[PDB]
Design an enzyme around this catalytic site. Structure first.
Site, PDB file in Angstrom:
ATOM      1  N   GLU A 171      49.279  41.149  50.361  1.00 12.42           N
ATOM      2  CA  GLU A 171      49.364  41.222  48.907  1.00 12.42           C
ATOM      3  C   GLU A 171      50.362  40.227  48.335  1.00 12.42           C
ATOM      4  O   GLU A 171      50.053  39.541  47.378  1.00 12.42           O
ATOM      5  CB  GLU A 171      49.753  42.629  48.432  1.00 12.42           C
ATOM      6  CG  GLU A 171      48.687  43.717  48.592  1.00 12.42           C
ATOM      7  CD  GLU A 171      47.418  43.454  47.802  1.00 12.42           C
ATOM      8  OE1 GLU A 171      47.468  42.723  46.797  1.00 12.42           O
ATOM      9  OE2 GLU A 171      46.360  43.994  48.175  1.00 12.42           O
TER      10      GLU A 171
ATOM     11  N   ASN B  43      44.838  38.461  36.329  1.00 13.42           N
ATOM     12  CA  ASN B  43      43.403  38.544  36.564  1.00 13.42           C
ATOM     13  C   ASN B  43      42.751  38.200  35.237  1.00 13.42           C
ATOM     14  O   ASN B  43      42.685  39.030  34.340  1.00 13.42           O
ATOM     15  CB  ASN B  43      43.011  39.957  37.020  1.00 13.42           C
ATOM     16  CG  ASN B  43      43.741  40.394  38.294  1.00 13.42           C
ATOM     17  OD1 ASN B  43      43.591  39.785  39.354  1.00 13.42           O
ATOM     18  ND2 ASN B  43      44.532  41.457  38.190  1.00 13.42           N
TER      19      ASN B  43
ATOM     20  N   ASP C 131      39.726  40.693  33.587  1.00 13.44           N
ATOM     21  CA  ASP C 131      40.018  41.901  32.828  1.00 13.44           C
ATOM     22  C   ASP C 131      41.360  41.892  32.099  1.00 13.44           C
ATOM     23  O   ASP C 131      41.746  42.899  31.517  1.00 13.44           O
ATOM     24  CB  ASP C 131      39.860  43.162  33.699  1.00 13.44           C
ATOM     25  CG  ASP C 131      40.938  43.298  34.761  1.00 13.44           C
ATOM     26  OD1 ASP C 131      41.655  42.323  35.032  1.00 13.44           O
ATOM     27  OD2 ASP C 131      41.071  44.409  35.318  1.00 13.44           O
TER      28      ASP C 131
ATOM     29  N   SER D 196      44.507  41.879  33.231  1.00 15.29           N
ATOM     30  CA  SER D 196      45.541  42.738  33.765  1.00 15.29           C
ATOM     31  C   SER D 196      46.346  41.835  34.677  1.00 15.29           C
ATOM     32  O   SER D 196      45.925  40.720  34.970  1.00 15.29           O
ATOM     33  CB  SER D 196      44.942  43.913  34.548  1.00 15.29           C
ATOM     34  OG  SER D 196      44.259  43.475  35.711  1.00 15.29           O
TER      35      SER D 196
ATOM     36  N   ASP E  85      48.910  41.844  38.374  1.00 14.07           N
ATOM     37  CA  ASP E  85      49.414  42.571  39.535  1.00 14.07           C
ATOM     38  C   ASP E  85      50.873  42.124  39.693  1.00 14.07           C
ATOM     39  O   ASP E  85      51.162  40.916  39.595  1.00 14.07           O
ATOM     40  CB  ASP E  85      48.606  42.226  40.790  1.00 14.07           C
ATOM     41  CG  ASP E  85      47.143  42.566  40.644  1.00 14.07           C
ATOM     42  OD1 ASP E  85      46.823  43.717  40.270  1.00 14.07           O
ATOM     43  OD2 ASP E  85      46.312  41.680  40.895  1.00 14.07           O
TER      44      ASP E  85
ATOM     45  N   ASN F 119      48.991  47.062  39.811  1.00 12.23           N
ATOM     46  CA  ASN F 119      48.244  46.684  38.612  1.00 12.23           C
ATOM     47  C   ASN F 119      48.667  47.325  37.294  1.00 12.23           C
ATOM     48  O   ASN F 119      48.777  48.561  37.205  1.00 12.23           O
ATOM     49  CB  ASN F 119      46.761  46.926  38.880  1.00 12.23           C
ATOM     50  CG  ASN F 119      45.858  46.311  37.829  1.00 12.23           C
ATOM     51  OD1 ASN F 119      45.463  46.969  36.890  1.00 12.23           O
ATOM     52  ND2 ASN F 119      45.487  45.068  38.026  1.00 12.23           N
TER      53      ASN F 119
END
Length: 130
Positions: free
Chosen positions: A35, A46, A49, A51, A53, A60
């Protein structure tokens, strides 16, 4: 902060991650590796959408932390996404524990399914003394 492998393994152990909800330390290590490369300041936007991380576990902003700029955002863990960018990972750990309380557990992270699930993950903790 960029963690060294074993330093991180002992820190997660101390925070009660070993076996949390049936998830071994080795699996959390596998997750952090893929990750963020064990980097606490890692962020990934991202575009699709809208959002983001955040942190070592790439938590998220749509469901687990609040950053104010995420459309249709919710807050299950209830933290500020900012808390997930600290050198001290206590809050990131508290958020990750909340994520796996849902029935999907660790499968919530797609990267875990691609490179950790049904594989030998011992390599992530070997020689660390945990």
């Amino acid at each position: 902060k960029a963690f060294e492998r074993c330093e991180l393994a002992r820190t997660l152990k101390r925070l009660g991650m070993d076996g949390y909800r049936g998830i071994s330390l080795a699996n959390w290590m596998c997750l952090a590796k893929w990750e963020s490369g064990y980097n606490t300041r890692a962020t990934n936007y991202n575009a699709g959408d809208r959002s983001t991380d955040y942190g070592i576990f790439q938590i998220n902003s749509r469901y687990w932390c609040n950053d104010g700029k995420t459309p249709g955002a919710v807050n299950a863990a209830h933290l500020s996404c900012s808390a997930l960018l600290q050198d001290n990972i206590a809050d990131a750990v508290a958020a990750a524990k909340r994520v796996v309380r849902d029935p999907q557990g660790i499968r919530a992270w797609v990267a875990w399914r691609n490179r950790c699930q049904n594989r030998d993950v011992r390599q992530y903790v070997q020689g660390c003394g945990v």
